[PDB]
A paper describes a structure:
Protein type III secretion systems (T3SSs) are organic nanosyringes that achieve an energy-dependent translocation of bacterial proteins through the two membranes of Gram-negative organisms. InvA is a member of a set of several inner membrane proteins that form this core of the T3SS. Highly conserved across pathogenic bacteria, as well as with a conserved homolog in the flagellar system (FlhA), InvA is critical to the functioning of the T3SS. InvA of S. typhimurium is 685 amino acids in length and the N-terminal 300 amino acids are comprised of seven transmembrane helices.
Numbering used by the authors: 358 to 523
């Protein structure tokens, strides 16, 4: 890989993320989990970028925008019982999926009650790995479709007749 991954980050978080060595954390973890070598990961200030937002660019094209609450912890196996403990999560919603976040102090209480918590940087890594994995799956899917159009012996009218039937 010769083209770097770029993460646009909030201007107020950039120096903390550099001090936390986010780039090396990401590169190191991805290699251990997958055996694949990420290109260099560069952080850049995102103009107008609100807090808790990260934009992934590859080859200067926007790939995905993540919502990660830098000062909070993600409740990985969140259940509604959390609320019965007096803890009301920060909820982020992306499509059909909800993500539940709590304070560091709340996180420590939930860890004693069977919950698993991920800090923001670990969740940011997780978001990247999920995005990278989703894109690879779809790429393979495109290839499967090309193979089916190669193997296809039925013509279009006959093919479309069969589809409406079933």
């Amino acid at each position: 890989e010769t083209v770097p991954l770029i993460l646009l980050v909030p201007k107020s978080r950039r120096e903390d993320l550099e001090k936390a060595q986010l780039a090396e954390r990401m590169r190191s973890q991805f290699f251990i989990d997958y055996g694949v070598r990420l290109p260099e990961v560069l952080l850049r200030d995102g103009e107008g970028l609100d807090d808790n937002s990260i934009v992934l660019l590859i080859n200067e094209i926007r790939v995905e925008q993540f919502t990660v609450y830098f000062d909070l912890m993600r409740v990985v196996n969140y259940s509604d019982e959390v609320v019965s403990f007096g803890i009301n999560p920060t909820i982020h919603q992306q499509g059909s999926s909800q993500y539940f976040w709590v304070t560091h102090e709340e996180g420590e209480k939930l860890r004693e009650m069977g919950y698993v918590l991920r800090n923001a940087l670990d969740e940011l890594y997780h978001c990247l790995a999920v995005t990278l994995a989703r894109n690879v799956n779809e790429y393979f899917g495109i290839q499967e479709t090309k193979h089916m159009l190669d193997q296809l012996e039925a013509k279009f009218p006959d093919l479309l007749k069969e589809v409406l039937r079933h």
